[PDB]
């Protein structure tokens, strides 16, 4: 398991049950009601999946696809952004954007 | 100063830091880019003054001195797009990209 950082979600990491990413003026919450909601900014954003399932969780994979699953692994919502195999990160940025970056192309060590 | 990440187009100015937990990336007065507690440095001490860290549209970390002359490059590059350098909590500086997906709270959904 990878340690959590407040504004980051790396491949393999999971958010559920009102777990959230936090930035300066923004929050991205995988809510108890199965809606993924970015609070803040002009319009905000939502997966628009309220009540679509039970005990939903958010997971970023190692191809850069962000997925909401319910308790039985029924796909609720997908970012539909599959790309080349590797390490990915979702950053809730201080400017409000939630951006998936990857794969890794440089590192200081293993 | 700021956060735990540098995006392409942003500058980490002289003595500016990026922090995640005990790991602190500092663009030093002596032009060395150093990841405190991370056993990494660019190794460019006394190679310039007023040095600055940038990240290119191809995901390369670049250090430049006061004049704008390139002191150091990370030497790993990918396609054109948006990139992010992150102080990973395991104490690595990692460049990720290009961007694959964006959640945007600033435009009509």
UniProtKB/Swiss-Prot annotation, chain A:
Motif range (Carbohydrate-binding motif 2): 31-39
Disulfide bonds: 34-56
Gene symbol of the encoding locus: L1
Full-protein positions shown: 140 to 249 of 256
Lineage: Eukaryota, Viridiplantae, Streptophyta, Embryophyta, Tracheophyta
Bulb-type lectin domain boundaries: 6-110
Protein name: Mannose-specific lectin 1 chain 2
Binding site for beta-D-mannose: 31-35, 39, 43-46
């Amino acid at each position: 398991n990878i340690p959590f950082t407040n504004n980051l979600l790396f491949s393999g990491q999971v958010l559920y049950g009102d777990g959230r990413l936090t930035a300066k003026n923004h929050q991205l919450v995988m809510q108890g009601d199965c809606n993924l909601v970015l609070y803040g900014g002009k319009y905000g954003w939502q997966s628009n999946t309220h009540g679509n399932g039970e005990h939903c969780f958010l997971r970023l994979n190692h191809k850069g696809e962000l997925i909401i699953k319910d308790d039985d692994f029924k796909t609720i919502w997908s970012s539909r952004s599959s790309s080349k195999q590797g390490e990915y990160v979702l950053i809730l940025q201080d400017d409000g954007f939630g951006v998936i970056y990857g794969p890794a192309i440089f590192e200081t060590s293993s | 100063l700021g956060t735990n990440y540098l995006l392409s187009g942003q500058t980490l100015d002289t003595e500016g830091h990026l922090k995640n937990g005990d790991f602190d990336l500092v663009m030093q007065d002596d032009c060395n880019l150093v990841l405190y507690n991370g056993n990494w440095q660019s190794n460019t001490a006394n190679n310039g003054r007023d040095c600055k860290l940038t990240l290119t549209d191809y995901g390369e970390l670049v250090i430049k001195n006061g004049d704008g002359s390139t002191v150091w490059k990370s030497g790993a590059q990918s396609v054109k797009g948006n990139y992010a350098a992150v102080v990973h909590p395991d104490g690595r500086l990692v460049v990720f990209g290009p961007s694959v997906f964006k959640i945007d709270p600033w435009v009509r959904g």
